[PDB]
């Protein structure tokens, strides 16, 4: 079984300089890419960084300074420079897939406490009655072609992928998401909705440039019973 | 019969002044008094101010300067009188109930777009149990409120309602599986016997009857995974 987890968070006091650990098992870095991701409480996901499984790190350019990525041969290492009460979050590692750099395998995450393309969501929360239909929009600044990835976050649980390469569907993910757009629009519809399928769904930018990767601001999607 | 209705949300360019109306059916405004809450796209619910029956108004310390309360016999008013991008939000009139500066019966609220000192701490921020499982949110208060505790429910794009006042006592149509308790500083919501219906995200607020006391917690969105 391939899987990963993150390990280091704490409480902290601001300068505090704090690292973070990525431990993998079922794969080897050798032949996998790794990303961190954040997540403040409320708020939505945000990329910081890449490393190659050759070790070529880039970073997101307001992460520059703030963070340092390393790897062992099982190990991928964040660390956090200087932090502040804005870098309160929960930081999760992700394994990119083949393709894009989207991330097809999520840690639980670790909670860390301290005492330019853009991406537009719409809408920012909708319910709709069991056996609905749903429909998200995403809008890119710049044409992104087909790089763009759908994910479900449960509340206090860990992203899911459903969709990479626009319309492509993840293993396991039933029919009834259906991905499409190309370029600068993009939608994700959720055909006969159930109960399960309350989550917040994020697009992603999975342009291979830092500064194309993008996450969306979410959408709170519920169903009404 | 007993209902509440706000008007006037539109779009506005920054510092067009505006007047929202707030419009009741079913009880008189000699009776109840009314009070003002806004919650801005994905973000928290604020508390803007009230109005007694006796027309005695109370705002926010930040609110104050940038809003303006006011009441005919059918409708209460409320006025930005400078709006900037930071005003974009759904506003919500709300009937306070009785014994506390917490709110029964709430608006579908009005969305308004803007284009070109007690601290409420909710833990865990994000929560997912298992069908029949129990989950437990803490709200904890910076200064003594005593028992003024109120709990709400709200589903993704729709309106509050309240579960619980006076730390403890069941809000009408409730459900004995949601229990709250505490005292001063430290409450505490427990959802028994979950069920997808409870999906949703749970807010506490300070019911406490000044306006330098009145705060919301910053939510806990609870999933049934």
């Known amino acids: 079984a391939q899987s990963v987890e993150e390990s280091g968070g704490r409480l902290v006091t601001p300068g505090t300089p704090l690292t973070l650990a990525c431990?993998?098992?079922?794969?080897?870095?050798?032949?996998?890419?790794?990303?961190?991701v954040r997540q403040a409480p409320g708020k939505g996901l945000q990329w910081?960084?890449?490393?190659?499984?050759?070790?070529?790190?880039?970073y997101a350019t307001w992460a520059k300074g703030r963070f340092t990525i390393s790897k062992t041969s099982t190990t991928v290492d964040l660390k956090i420079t200087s932090p502040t009460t804005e870098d309160t979050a929960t930081?999760?590692?992700?394994?990119?897939?083949?393709?894009?750099?989207?991330?097809?395998?999520?840690?639980?995450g670790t909670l860390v406490t301290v005492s330019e393309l853009d991406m537009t969501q719409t809408p920012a929360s909708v319910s709709e009655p069991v056996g609905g239909t749903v429909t998200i929009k995403c809008?890119?600044?710049?044409?992104?072609?087909?790089?763009?990835?759908?994910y479900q976050q449960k509340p206090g649980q860990r992203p899911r992928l459903?969709?990479?390469?626009?319309?492509?569907?993840?293993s396991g993910v039933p029919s009834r998401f259906k991905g499409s757009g190309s370029g600068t629009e993009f939608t994700l519809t959720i055909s006969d909705l159930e109960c399960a399928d309350a989550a917040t769904?994020?697009?992603?930018?999975?342009?291979?440039?830092?500064?194309?990767?993008?996450?969306?601001?979410g959408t709170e999607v519920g169903v009404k019973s | 019969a007993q209902s509440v209705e706000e008007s006037g949300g539109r779009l506005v360019t920054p510092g067009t002044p505006l007047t929202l109306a707030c419009t009741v059916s079913?009880?008189?405004?000699?009776?109840?008094?009314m009070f003002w809450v806004r919650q801005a796209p994905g973000k928290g619910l604020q508390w803007i101010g009230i109005?007694?029956?006796?027309?005695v108004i109370y705002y926010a310390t930040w609110a104050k300067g940038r809003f303006t309360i006011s009441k005919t016999s059918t409708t209460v008013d409320l006025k930005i009188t400078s709006p900037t991008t930071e005003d974009t939000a759904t506003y919500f009139c709300?009937?306070?109930?009785?014994?506390?500066?917490?709110?029964?019966?709430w608006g579908p609220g009005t969305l308004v777009t803007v284009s070109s000192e007690l601290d409420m701490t909710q833990t865990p921020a994000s929560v997912s149990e298992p069908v029949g499982g129990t989950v437990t949110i803490k709200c904890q208060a910076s200064?003594?409120?005593?028992?003024?505790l109120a709990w709400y429910q709200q589903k993704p794009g729709q309106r509050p309602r309240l579960l619980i006042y006076?730390?403890?006592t069941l809000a009408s149509g409730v459900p004995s599986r949601f229990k709250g308790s505490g005292s001063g500083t430290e409450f505490t919501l427990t959802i028994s016997d979950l069920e997808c219906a409870d999906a949703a995200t749970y807010y506490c607020?300070?019911?406490?009857?000044?306006?330098?006391?009145?705060?919301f917690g910053g939510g806990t969105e609870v999933g049934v995974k």
């Open positions: 709300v009937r306070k109930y009785g014994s506390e500066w917490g709110g029964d019966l």
């Open positions: 079913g009880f008189s405004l000699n009776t109840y008094s």
């Open positions: 109005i007694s029956n006796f027309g």
């Open positions: 200064q003594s409120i005593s028992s003024y």
């Open positions: 006076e730390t403890s």
């Open positions: 607020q300070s019911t406490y009857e000044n306006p330098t006391y009145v705060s």
